[PDB]
Amino acid sequence: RRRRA
Amino acid sequence: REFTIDFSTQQSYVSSLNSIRTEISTPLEHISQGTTSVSVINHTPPGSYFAVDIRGLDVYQARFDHLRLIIEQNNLYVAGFVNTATNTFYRFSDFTHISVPGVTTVSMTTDSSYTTLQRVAALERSGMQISRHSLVSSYLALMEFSGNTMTRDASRAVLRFVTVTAEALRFRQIQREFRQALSETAPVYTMTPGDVDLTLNWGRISNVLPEYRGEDGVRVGRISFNNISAILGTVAVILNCHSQPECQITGDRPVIKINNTLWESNTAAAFLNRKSQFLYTTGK
Amino acid sequence: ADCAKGKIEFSKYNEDDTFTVKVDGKEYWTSRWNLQPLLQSAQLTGMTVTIKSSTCESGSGFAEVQFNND
Amino acid sequence: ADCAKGKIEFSKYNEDDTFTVKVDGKEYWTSRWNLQPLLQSAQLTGMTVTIKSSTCESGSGFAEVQFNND
Amino acid sequence: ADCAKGKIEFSKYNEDDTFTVKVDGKEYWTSRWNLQPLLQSAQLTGMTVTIKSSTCESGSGFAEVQFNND
Amino acid sequence: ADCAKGKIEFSKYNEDDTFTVKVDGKEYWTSRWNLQPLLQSAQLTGMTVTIKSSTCSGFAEVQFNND
Amino acid sequence: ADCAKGKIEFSKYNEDDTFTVKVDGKEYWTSRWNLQPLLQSAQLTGMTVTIKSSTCESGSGFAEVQFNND
């Protein structure tokens, strides 16, 4: 999973 | 739980962040000086959030005061934003498990990944400028926003507010660099490639720092710390890796100590997996 | 076509000496020998890889891949 | 068949240039040169591997292995 | 001449057997396979690389590069 | 036979393209090129290596164990 | 002779596919390709390397190097 804000 | 982040002055801003950190996290035994530490987020049940009320965009004035951020407590992700004037919670698609009583929840089609937000915003974080003025502009954009799908301006506003709230909570480096923009000079904070890399390595850092025992250095991918002051000057809050999925990429070994430096094991593995160079290059 | 952009969920060394990665729920193989350590290094460090190929169905081959930090 | 899934308990470079790993209590050898550093890096980081072979008894050969993120 | 100095932002292997890196906002490529693991390790460890060439045209090939920890 | 068991005290690339390791106070060399990264990785990560050989000089069999 | 002993200050891939390291203020190059990633690993991890050669003038060649940890 790519970085979430 | 609700906290205020007050942007009136550097003092009020740093005080706000420190109070949040104190409430939601516990210092690491081995990375703590005075009341300034790398702290581990205290365990909360999945779905737990805290609210952040944005204040002081206009210095010490009770205006621009209708924006609240919903922050998932275990990972500090912004789950969405609340317009307290319309009592509406705009929630990113990756946070349908975050339930906020009392508000109208608008479930958005947009997810909260930086990839998505940068695309919709047509704005890259590397080089992105943040000032008091653009935080006010961001606030107005979020207050004007309506509907289930983020617009460009709403996405730009979220990029800026997440940087100066959640990412600054995580990284004392970002707290320190951004806070200069709050001064009377009103300069511009430009978020650097190094700032971006820190945010992208937060999970990996979180898995490594609990193992620190005073080694001369710490190496986590592209991130390097050469002493405790560098660690403390850069990192303030990490995930609880005891646990959270962001703590692990692959394997089960957090660290390797090499020549008095604490390495993320996966980083060393990733440059020690090459075969003989002559065989590599000629075997095309 | 841009087939996949994501983290490597697993890699596999195949009996025909090609190398497979699973990205965004689909499997892609490459015969490019140079890519085998690079892809494993990506998996080890959680890099985002971008797989590009003329076909993007699971089981398609590729020779072009971008390695991103972000 | 999927013969053994788990961490590499030891690895061994062999006189005939094959390479042995012990997984889930059983030893397997491979003649795939490129697997040697890949397996060692998996070993050093505790990466779970799945050994795949026609026969799963300790002492069996393999030419296919999956690198997992468990 | 020193074309670019900085950390590697991304790297990419292309179907035409070239390996691109982006450094300090500029893209350069090399077909030296020797440089692929060296450049990727530099990328994943945050080394400062200095791309060097006789002429530093954007998008030009290179086969000289310095590696620094800082 | 198990010629030596322990951590690699130093390694050395040799002018004849062989590779030497010192383990448990004794020096051994190998001509197998792929052992060069395998041994240096072991040395860097603190692996216990077991150098094995019919005569315990050169070697081409070595076992690697994590600490 | 022991030409230089210390940590690798920088390394550099050269256009003739040789590889330069700077150790204790002196530069040495090797044409042994196998040394390129090993020296990079040593540089990344701060090993103490001992350059050995019958000529120890800075700028000279080498093909013998010892790697030590702290």
Numbering used by the authors:
A (entry chain G): 6 to 10
B (entry chain A): 1 to 242, 256 to 297
C (entry chain D), D (entry chain C), E (entry chain E), G (entry chain F): 1 to 70
F (entry chain B): 1 to 56, 60 to 70
Q: What is written in the article reporting this PDB entry?
A:
Shiga toxin (Stx), a major virulence factor of enterohemorrhagic Escherichia coli (EHEC), can cause fatal systemic complications. All Stx proteins consist of a catalytic A-subunit and a B-subunit pentamer. The catalytic A-subunit, which is a member of ribosome-inactivating proteins (RIPs), has an RNA N-glycosidase activity that cleaves a specific adenine from 28S ribosomal RNA to inhibit eukaryotic protein synthesis. The B-subunit pentamer functions to bind Galα–Galβ–Glcβ-ceramide (Gb3), a glycolipid present on the surface of target cells.
To elucidate the precise manner by which these shorter peptides bind to Stx2a, X-ray crystallography analysis was performed with co-crystals of each peptide and the Stx2a holotoxin, which were obtained via the soaking method. We were able to determine electron densities for AR4A-mono, R4A-mono, R3A-mono, and R2A-mono, and X-ray crystal structures were solved to final resolutions of 1.80, 1.80, 1.90, and 1.75 Å-resolution, respectively. These structures reveal that the AR4A-mono, R4A-mono, R3A-mono, and R2A-mono peptides bind tightly to the catalytic A-subunit. In all cases, the common Arg8-Arg9-Ala10 motif (numbering reflects residue position in full-length MMβA-mono) interacts equally with the Glu72, Tyr77, Val78, Asp94, Ser112, Tyr114, Thr115, Glu167, Arg170, Thr199, and Gly203 residues present in the catalytic pocket of the A-subunit, whereas the Arg8 and Arg9 residues of the motif electrostatically interact with Glu167 and Asp94, respectively. The amide group of the Ala10, but not its side chain, interacts with the Val78, Ser112 and Arg170 residues. In addition, Arg6 and Arg7 of both AR4A-mono and R4A-mono electrostatically interact, respectively, with Asp94 of the A-subunit and Asp70 of the B-subunit, which is adjacent to the catalytic cavity. Overall, we find that the binding patterns of these shorter peptides are almost identical to that of MMβA-mono. We found that R4-mono, AR4A-mono, R4A-mono, and R3-mono exhibit greater inhibitory effects (relative IC50 values = 0.387, 2.27, 2.70, and 3.68 µM, respectively) than non-tagged MMβA-mono (relative IC50 = 8.14 µM), which was used as a positive control to compete the binding. Although the precise mechanism of the detrimental effect of the C-terminal Ala is remained to be elucidated, the presence of the amide group of the C-terminal Ala may contribute to fix the binding manner of the peptides with this Ala, such as MMbA-mono, AR4A-mono, R4A-mono, R3A-mono, and R2A-mono, to the same orientations which are clearly demonstrated in their crystal structures.
